[PDB]
Amino acid sequence: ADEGSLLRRAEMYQDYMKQVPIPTNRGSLIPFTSWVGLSISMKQLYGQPLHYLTNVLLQRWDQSRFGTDSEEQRLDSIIHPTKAEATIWLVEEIHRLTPSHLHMALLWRSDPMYHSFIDPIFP
Amino acid sequence: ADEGSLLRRAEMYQDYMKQVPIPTNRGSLIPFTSWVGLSISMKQLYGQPLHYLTNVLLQRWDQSRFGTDSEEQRLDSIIHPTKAEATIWLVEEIHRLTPSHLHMALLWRSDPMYHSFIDPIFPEK
Amino acid sequence: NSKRLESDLEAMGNKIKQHEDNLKFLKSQKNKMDEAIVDLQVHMSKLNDINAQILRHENSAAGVLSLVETLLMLTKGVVGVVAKLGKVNDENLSQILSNYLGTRSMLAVVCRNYESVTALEAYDNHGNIDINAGLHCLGSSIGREIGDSFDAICLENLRPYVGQHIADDLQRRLDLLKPKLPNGECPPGFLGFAVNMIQIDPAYLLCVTSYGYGLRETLFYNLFSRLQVYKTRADMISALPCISDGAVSLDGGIIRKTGIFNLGNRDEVNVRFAKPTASRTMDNYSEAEKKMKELKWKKEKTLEDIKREQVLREHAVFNFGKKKEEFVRC
Amino acid sequence: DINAQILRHENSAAGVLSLVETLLMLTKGVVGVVAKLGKVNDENLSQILSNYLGTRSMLAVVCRNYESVTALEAYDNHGNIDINAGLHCLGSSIGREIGDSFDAICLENLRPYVGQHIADDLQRRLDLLKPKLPNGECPPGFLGFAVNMIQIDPAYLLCVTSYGYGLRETLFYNLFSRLQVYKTRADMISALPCISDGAVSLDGGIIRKTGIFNLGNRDEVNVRFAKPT
Amino acid sequence: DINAQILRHENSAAGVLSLVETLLMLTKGVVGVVAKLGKVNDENLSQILSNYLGTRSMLAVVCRNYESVTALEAYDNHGNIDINAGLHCLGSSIGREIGDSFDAICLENLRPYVGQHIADDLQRRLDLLKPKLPNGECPPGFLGFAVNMIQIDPAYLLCVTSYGYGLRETLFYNLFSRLQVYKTRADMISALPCISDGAVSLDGGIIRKTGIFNLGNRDEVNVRFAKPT
Amino acid sequence: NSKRLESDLEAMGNKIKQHEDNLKFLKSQKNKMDEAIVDLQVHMSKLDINAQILRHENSAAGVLSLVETLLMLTKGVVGVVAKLGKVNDENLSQILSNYLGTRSMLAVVCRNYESVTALEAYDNHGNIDINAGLHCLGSSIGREIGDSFDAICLENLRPYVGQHIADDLQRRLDLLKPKLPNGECPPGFLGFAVNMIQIDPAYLLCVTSYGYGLRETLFYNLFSRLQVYKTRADMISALPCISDGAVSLDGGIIRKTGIFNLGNRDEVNVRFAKPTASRTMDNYSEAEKKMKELKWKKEKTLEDIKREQVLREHAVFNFGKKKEEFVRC
């Protein structure tokens, strides 16, 4: 009962995120502390959600910096925010067009409460 | 005895990858079929390794496409190769400058034979 | 080719039919969620000092809200006050955390969305506060007026803790990498982080924010950002290179940043975090309340997916109608 | 006059040091009071930056090393701050006492801003990144960064700490850590995604962090930054 | 003459259909032989594309639908190909027999090249992406794609299959699926990271896939593509 | 100004001593690996297809098999495709050999591309000189190589970009089974052909420089996602399910989706070998694959030594220039 339900949810969500267009103008420069900070800002300057895989990847990029004392090193000194927005738009285009719903249904079968990465916003 | 060797190896590897520069001229068009094919062809044109985390990410992207009948679509037609080459260069710059070796040593501890992803390509000469 | 377009139109018909089937699927699952939440409502219906310290601060807005709780949409939007939401076991460490926060961040009002922030205040063309604002109208209607600048926190705009959690336990407390000497060990007087000290009400552990975040991950992580608690003062200065942003001694002085130190006669704060009262029956009732809040959050997420699929179905309707009109015109 | 404004807060230690300056190694190690070190061209912007910092960090004593911090206060085995401390003996000998906690900043242990400066401008203004909307240039109400608003004494621009860092890099960076200054409250709310740390509206209310909104009848702080002369 | 080259391979079925064409529904459904359908301007490039495809796919019969494939051959319950099949009865009635396996391409079940075309050029050449080195333009030996080298009969450019696809989109795309043609063997090896499917060197050896290198004394194929007239 | 410069080269000397300690640790690890492989090597030292290759006299595989019955050329070559894979039954081996054809069946396979370059020599005319390595060796011992032959290098092969079956021996690749539009599988489907080959367990892992197997590199690039169907009518009945290739266990084969073979099936005399029923050879081969894994990990630790050597040399040069800059100031 859970298998077909999660497979259908994955197919529907991938159809919608396939439907959404990447925006036209990208000339912006958001000062930012963490990756999830830039994503939460960039979901507000643009009226567009991000993919599930993009939110999960940005949380893992944020957790990949913990430990060694570069947390106190401010991130936008390392990465110019034009480059960071370019990475998030290109990685979101990859996660919108290419992936299958079988892989994503497997990932949703791994964890419940997976809605923490699906955005409520929609154009 | 295991975890100290893992941590010191991860620290040495992370220092070596932070040492590596990202190249100046990146204007090329590589017709490609899968992500790993692009990574291999781009390691061969640009004599530079990729990170461990970059190769893990590209394999997981390439496994994410299995399933739905999208393998019959050539990935060259879905994503223009200049775009995807720019994605892989910028994600490599993220994985080179930002990471701490403690998390990477945790990931190396989680599975043996982690040298499958570490490239023997040296930028010297 | 006409035959290709006719086959494609039949394919679009199959697509629109599977869209309406997906709609029926989601409507059925939403009805299941409604059944479960009404069952939990009737079960919860079957299962059925800090206020003085708030009211001493007569000029501040927390006293206004507490006096209204003794006696509109503002009380719908506002979650509560920071002093009400936290509970600390011992008297001493509660007083020291109150001294760290101060009487402004302690008396802050917390509300869900930013429109609930704009509901509290009304500004003129000049920008000055006009009494037509909600809290000002209501406080002037009941009594005292708000001269003190009070603080408003919206939970949606807060930067969530982008980090892992401790898996095996209740209270969802936050694992962070403990401070370390440049060679030796952890510092000796270390007593724990302070964000883990606050015992959260189990109604607010999950599904408060629309993303599903807890209250420790959002509110008290932003008020208590990675500060360490140390047992004695000399242990605290002894651990000077090891500390992040804040640090607190359990005897005396507190420090705010890495270089900033505090010293002098310690200004106390009247309001305090309460001591939690562990009663098993109210624990079970608040467990049912937690289950209620989690069910309602999943119902809201299914409803958002229903809106999403309605958008897709309307796009398919428009495209099918346009293509069939172009085909008939061809 | 600013020294009268310091001396109004009689329970402080800044009024005690001002009373010393009108009439030991304490006043040798101490660089001075924060409100003495910063000058602001106009009046309204000075008032709102003072309301941002508050009367506790505005009256902070500023010393160089942590040895000066140990010189200011003395602790016994009881853990209590007795009279035998530095400024407590000094205030008991001269006059008013210190019953409020006050802030003691040491410039050695602070975090310096290791970022590129503007090359040609005086006062060594910070080369900090300005936000931009998705369409074009800067947000509509953007007046600029508050750490570069402070007009400073030219004696303190270089070699104040032991490493040769200035005072804008150490003190005012750690007090005003990249916060925008906006002309209008509506222009501050409309540019809320671009502000990183904090924002200060030139007519009314301010925000310390991202989610935290300060609002209501504006509580004033009696101490302000001086006029530049 | 190309029909003599078809008739040299007497054990084929293409020689059988050529002997029919010199003298049923088999020759009604069959579009024809691959070497008859393609024309190449020069001689060397035709020889090396013929060496690439081999004498088995070069002598392939090409029919439209799978019903024509069922018309060509008949299977009994034994599973053996008896005489009672189409071309076996036809060859037994006319002359030579068919002892070699031969290739039967159906144009309906093939994978059409559903990608953009060049707008202005005749023969509907494919709009395919050309590789580029990291410095500048194309690799140094790049002569171009082999599916666009084929000069085709203008009767077969449109509506050959039922969906209106051409013959370059279906047959020659599925025989020459994006393989580069390079002038020099060293220019083929030096541009090895950019070649996706295959590469053909205009003097010598070729590669079918990425890791697979063909080398040694060059085995020739007697059948070639025709000259264009 | 001077104190931060002093702390800079102080910390730089601390880092270069850290480099030297890390070098010594890795030399310790390499020597422990050397001790383990010497112990297992003395533990190991303490304990027809060739006629079918030799019927192809003009082929280079017959040349290499004849020279093995009697340099750097035959050291780089891993082997011949007919001698690497093994199939239990005879019929399926005949059909897979008919599928691959006698040019790729007699393909030499070597590790590195330099071994491909060593096999042949080309002049400015491009003609194949006798001065080529295999042509010198064949002419020196006898018959010449007039047939074109295939040369696979294991480094440039695109490895299967996918998962395996974890618990199962011989590392059988899991691929997605073909699916009807209905929920069922096609009935004739026995398996993919690349899982059918039973492989020598010495070649299961670390053959490649990346540690890739041989089923990943060689047999996936030969037998790429094709099906093996029991009867012919099963293969025609499941045509929309098939994607890359199909092979019937009764008769004919199809290379692509639309390309059909039909007619009298030309046989291939070179076949896959049948497996060996002995058991002690399997124990020796397990010792061999343990040796190969230890050799691969030793090579990787040597490369890690090379990385750290590059780090210490650059750090020494930076330390010398920084000492000169501070003494000059």
Author numbering:
A (entry chain A): 39 to 161
B (entry chain B): 39 to 163
C (entry chain C): 52 to 99, 117 to 139, 147 to 405
D (entry chain D), E (entry chain F): 117 to 139, 147 to 352
F (entry chain E): 52 to 98, 117 to 139, 147 to 405
What does the paper say about this structure?
RdDM requires two plant-specific RNA polymerases known as RNA polymerase IV (Pol IV) and RNA polymerase V (Pol V), and a number of accessory proteins with different functions. All together, these observations have positioned the DDR complex as a key component that acts downstream of the methylation readers SUVH2/SUVH9 to recruit Pol V to RdDM loci. We report here the structures of the Arabidopsis Pol V recruitment complexes DR (DMS3-RDM1) and DDR′ (DRD1 peptide 7-DMS3-RDM1). The structures of the two complexes are similar at their core—two DMS3 dimers bridged by an RDM1 dimer.
Using single-particle cryoEM, we determined the structure of the DR complex to an overall resolution of 3.6 Å. The cryoEM structure shows that the stoichiometry of DMS3:RDM1 is 4:2. The two RDM1 molecules in the DR complex form a dimer at the center of the complex. Surrounding this RDM1 dimer core are four DMS3 molecules that form two dimers, each binding to the exposed sides of a RDM1 monomer of the dimer core, opposing one another. In addition, the two DMS3 dimers bridge to each other across the RDM1 dimer core using two CC arms. Interestingly, while the two DMS3 dimers are similar to one another, the two monomers within each DMS3 dimer differ in their structures: one shows both visible hinge and CC domains, while the other monomer has a visible hinge but unresolved CC domain in the structure. DMS3 dimerizes using two hinge domains in a hand-shake configuration, forming a donut shape. Our cryoEM structure of the DR complex also reveals numerous interactions between DMS3 dimer and RDM1, with a buried interface with an estimated area of ~31% of the RDM1 dimer surface area. Notably, both pockets are occupied by the CC arm of DMS3 in our cryoEM structure (inset 3). We hypothesize that the DR complex might represent an early intermediary complex prior to the formation of the full DDR complex.
